[PDB]
Structures are given as C-alpha cells and as structure tokens.
Write a protein that binds this ligand. Structure first.
Ligand SMILES: *[C@H](O)[C@H](C[C@@H]1CCNC1=O)NC(=O)[C@@H]1[C@@H]2[C@H](CN1C(=O)[C@@H](NC(=O)OC(C)C)C(C)(C)C)C2(C)C
Ligand SMILES: *[C@H](O)[C@H](C[C@@H]1CCNC1=O)NC(=O)[C@@H]1[C@@H]2[C@H](CN1C(=O)[C@@H](NC(=O)OC(C)C)C(C)(C)C)C2(C)C
Lengths: 306, 306
C-alpha cells in the first residue's frame, strides 16, 4: 500500500535531449531520428522578443548559425524549417537511442511527467496536470525552454508538451510538439494573463477512491445526491461540472470499492460544506486534483512498462 | 519559479534491473558488473517465512536453483553468498550498462528517489525520506521487493535503500545495499512495530526558505527567539530538536534571503501556535518536511547531472 505522486521512468527521454545554441541564446532540443525539435524563439535576441516577425527573421539565417551539441559531440545542421511555434532542424546523423514514439495533443485535466533540463542535461522529473485554464504549475528557471512532458504506454513514448515561457503569476505555458500553444498565449513579450482557474472535479473523486482502496474511510456517509444537485454545489465552490462521461470513466473504481459514484459525490459535497475539521486524506489537508482515474488504477494495481 | 517534489532522472538505474526467481518466489535484483543483489528471503516459501534459519536454508541450494532474467535474456549463476540480509549471485556476464556507482548508508532525515519495479521492469519514480523512526512512507505492492532507492551526484549513482517488507500501519522497511536493516526490524513474519514518529524540524525550515525564494512571505514576523526557547516549543508539538549543526547547514539559504535562521524559527513557532488560518504555503495546507536544505538549493538554482 501507500499513495505517492508518481512520475514515469525517464530513461527513454533522457537519451533524446540535446543543446541548441544560436547567437546568444541557449536552450534544449529533442533529437528523434535525424531531426531536432526546439522552440522558435531561439532565433530571437533580448530585443527581438518584444514584437518579432519570425518568418522575416528566419529567412536571414544560414544552417551554420545553429550549433547543436549532443554530449560532447557536435551535430551539424543540413536544413531547417518552421512549423507554427517550433523549429525543425535536420541533422546528418540519426539518433541511435530513438525510442518508439508519438506526438499527442492532450485535453485539460490530463496528467504527464516533465523532465526538466538545462544545456541539454536532465535535472529532475516530476508529475504535472494541464489546468482548465491551459497553464501548468511547474518548476522552471532560465534555460529550461525545450524541456518536454510525456506519458509512457508499454514501450511507446507519447510526447505532449514543450516548455516556452512563464507568466506573471508564476505558472507556465507552452506548446504541443507540433508547435501549437495550449491556451490563448503567444510567444511574444507582451501583456497576457491566465484567466481564472477551477478545480478538476473528476480527479478529486478518483483520489477519494484511492483513499478508500488504501484504508481511509472517515469521510464517507450514508447520503446520496443527484447529478444536478451535486453540480449546483460544485459551481458555488469553483469546481468544474461533472458530466455523465466522467461518471462512466469512474466505473471501474466504483466496482472495485463498492461505492456508487453518486454516493462519493455526496461525500465530496459534505467535505466542501464542512471542511476537513482537522483531519487528513492520504497525507493531505487539501482536496487533491492532479491524479486521473487512470493514474489511480496504475498505482493501486502495479502496471509496468518496457 | 515554482516548487515541486522532484526525483532524480532514473535512466542509469533502469539499465540495472533484473528478475530473480527461486522456487515459487519472484522479486527484483540489481545487476552491477557481474553480480546481482537481491533480498535473501527469495530462498523462503510461504511457510519458511514464519521463523527461518537462512544459513541452514542456503546450504541446501544449488546454483541452478536461481533463475535470473535480464529482458528476454537468461543469465546463469556461477556462485552465490549471503551478506547480512542480501544475496549476492555471481553471473557469467558483466552488465555493459553499469554506471559509475557507490553504496551508502544514510542518516534519518535524508531524502532519496525510489524506482518501483515488478518482474524486473520499472513502474514509476518518486521522492521519499528516511523518517526518524527508520521507516519510509512509500508506495509498494506484492512483488516490489528488491526495488532500490538512490541519489545522483554528477555521473555517480549512490545507492542507499533496498525494499524488503511492509508493516501493519502501511509504512515500509528495508536495508542498505550491504543488507543491514534501517531500524530495529528483522526479515521475519512476527510482531514488530514502528515506534512513534516525529517531524523533521530542519527540513520544515528549509521549505519555508523555499517559499520566500518563490514569493510567499505572509508568515514572517518581526520577532525572534533563542535556540533553547524554540526547542521548548518544538518538543510540545512532537518536532525533533534543532542543533547548532542544523543552524549552520541553513546558512546559505539564510544568506540568499536575508532572514536569519533564528528569525525563521520565530515564524515556525507562531505557525505551530496559531495554525495557518485558511492560508497555504507552496500549495500546501500542512507544514512539509521531506525537502532537505540541499534539495531546496538544487531546485531553486538549477543543478543538472551527467
Ligand atoms: C526559456 O528558457 C524561458 C524560460 C522561462 C524563464 C523563467 N522561467 C521560465 O519558464 N522562456 C522565456 O524566456 C520566454 C521567451 C521570452 C520571454 N519569456 C518569458 O517567459 C517571459 N515571460 C513573459 O514575457 O510573459 C508575458 C508577460 C506573457 C519572462 C518575463 C519570464 C522572461 C519569450 C519569447 C516569451
Ligand atoms: C516483497 O515483494 C514483499 C513486499 C510487500 C508486500 C506488500 N507490500 C510490500 O511492501 N515483502 C514481503 O512479502 C515481506 C517478506 C515476508 C512477509 N513480508 C511482509 O512485508 C509482510 N509484513 C510483515 O510480516 O510485517 C511484520 C508484521 C513485521 C506482509 C504481511 C505485508 C506480507 C517477509 C520475509 C518479511
């Protein structure tokens, strides 16, 4: 037993990270087969970034302007192109450590692992979720641009995030691997703000099921509620609406514990109305919302990868 | 900015994990050069484990009784010996993925990363601390024995934990890599209990410094306190005593923020006496104690490894 915020093993992604230098800017890139992916603002300078025209800036570059370092081995660039907000630099060598992989664009509420890197070298790994307002609450410093987020399924790495920028409230914004931003943000140094966030209701319920699987049961009651009456309380406390699709996804966890989904909703309602009154759940004094129903089942059942 | 519970990148350790089967027991082993390390209760059965005599049980085994699987490649055993509570199985092939490494036995309060495995295949990675009562609050199921805990420094992997067993309160116990248990526990299925735990004072203070580095400042005050008066309040709330050695270790964090160590102690005292009154620190509603002063500096400064 036990329950922890668990990331995927990161070895398959470590073997893909490289350093990309152009002018006075250094950031991280992702090396898969004979292409390196990185954020397009690597072609900017500390005065280009105020309002750049990237097409007009890229047509002024040559291949040899791009310095790509893989360990202490130099890869030279033989072509380049821009796709939305990412650069694709073609190099003369295929990465022999290329795993099986895919690019995927995720929905708000889904979770992923982040391998934070500086100068092409990995620093640490942690678990994140895409918030309803399309930011992520990460841990990023100068030079971390180009670090990626990912999920692993068997032997296949599904890449879903590349890091670009930090907003004034201390949260983070970036793109999928095809260079499209999550949210309304643009890669320009001008006023933008996150928009108000909300709590991911379906994930909170999944975490209450994890507590029961592990022996915490003090928060249950004998009451119940309808979906509509629950959603009327949820709106009041700034929670996202729960759909019937969400109810259906929580089926397996309901069947393993014997607690109907709408009975667990009546328990959340009482916790929202009464607080916790000095008690904890799975070592937490707040209601936690960055575990999906999938996350709970993998950790409480023991699925591996290869 | 931001602050997360961050584990080390796990690729160097993934390349060392193998499967060890003997009789009806399967668990994980660690393959470094031409030796595989695993827990000695792999030679037991579901009735040997009640009160075994391991010396008398090992002298009844032959090399071919041990089945070692590395991927879908079979390593055969050519010798074996027992050291305290671990087996060392010598095999005819050296692991070509052996990193630079050391074995170390850690003190209570230190943190490490855990790579949880089943059947020799990694499942996930998370951060832990050795509690004052020599248990760890992990996430482990049947078959996870032999999974290891570790720290990384530059290119060197320092192994510090191997998992053996779970106690009735849901916490975990194990050994260093030379087979000596942390705590009073023994590898026998008999009544043992953890002993009362305490909160790791020096780590809580380090985490309050992390909050200030990141912009949280509502909990500070203009008061101060002596070391002895602080330790008199700490004992009351079941915190560990703070030594002058602890004060000295918190020097760099004090110098970067401009807040003297004993001023931060006066802030903790007020938080212990008054509670948080509905506010959070670094996204937490409890005082967090599994970040060392070293952990804070690496994440707030950006150190990598290679
Ligand atoms: C690339 O490594 C950095 C990573 C940042 C640095 C601090 N934490 C991070 O995550 N990204 C940028 O430098 C990025 C590029 C330049 C300016 N930024 C920012 O992230 C800035 N933020 C910003 O302009 O937000 C506005 C208000 C929407 C800032 C102030 C943090 C440097 C680009 C092209 C956006
Ligand atoms: C080896 O993979 C398992 C891992 C356990 C299983 C559940 N969670 C885990 O961490 N270890 C054992 O099976 C271990 C060996 C047999 C019995 N155990 C236990 O961990 C038992 N606990 C126990 O006897 O604690 C006493 C009360 C001190 C138990 C009941 C969980 C199976 C050995 C040799 C101790």
């Amino acid at each position: 037993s036990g329950f922890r915020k668990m990331a995927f093993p990161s070895g398959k992604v470590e073997g893909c990270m490289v350093q990309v230098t152009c002018g006075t800017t250094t950031l991280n890139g992702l090396w898969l087969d004979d292409v390196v992916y990185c954020p397009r603002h690597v072609i900017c300078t500390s005065e280009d970034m105020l309002n750049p025209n990237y097409e007009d800036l890229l047509i002024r570059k040559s291949n040899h302007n791009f310095l790509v370092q893989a360990g202490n081995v130099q890869l030279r660039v033989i072509g380049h192109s821009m796709q939305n907000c990412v650069l694709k630099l073609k190099v003369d060598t295929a990465n022999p450590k290329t795993p099986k992989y895919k690019f995927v664009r995720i929905q708000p509420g889904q979770t992923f692992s982040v391998l934070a890197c500086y100068n092409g070298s990995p620093s640490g790994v942690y678990q994140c979720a895409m918030r309803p307002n399309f930011t992520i609450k990460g841990s990023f410093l100068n030079g971390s641009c180009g670090s990626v987020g990912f999920n692993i399924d068997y032997d296949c790495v599904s890449f879903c995030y590349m890091h670009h920028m930090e907003l004034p409230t201390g949260v983070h914004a970036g793109t999928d691997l095809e260079g499209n931003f999550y949210g309304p943000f643009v890669d320009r140094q001008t006023a933008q703000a996150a928009g108000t966030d909300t709590t991911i209701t379906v994930n909170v319920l999944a975490w209450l099921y994890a507590a029961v699987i592990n022996g915490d049961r003090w928060f249950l009651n004998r009451f119940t509620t309808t979906l509509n009456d629950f959603n009327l309380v949820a709106m009041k406390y700034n929670y996202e609406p729960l759909t019937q699709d969400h109810v259906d996804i929580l089926g397996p966890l309901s069947a393993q514990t014997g607690i109907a989904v709408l009975d667990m909703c009546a328990s959340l309602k009482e916790l929202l109305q009464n607080g916790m009154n000095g008690r904890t759940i799975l070592g937490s004094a707040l209601l936690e919302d960055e575990f999906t129903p999938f996350d709970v089942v993998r950790q409480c059942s023991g699925v591996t990868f290869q």
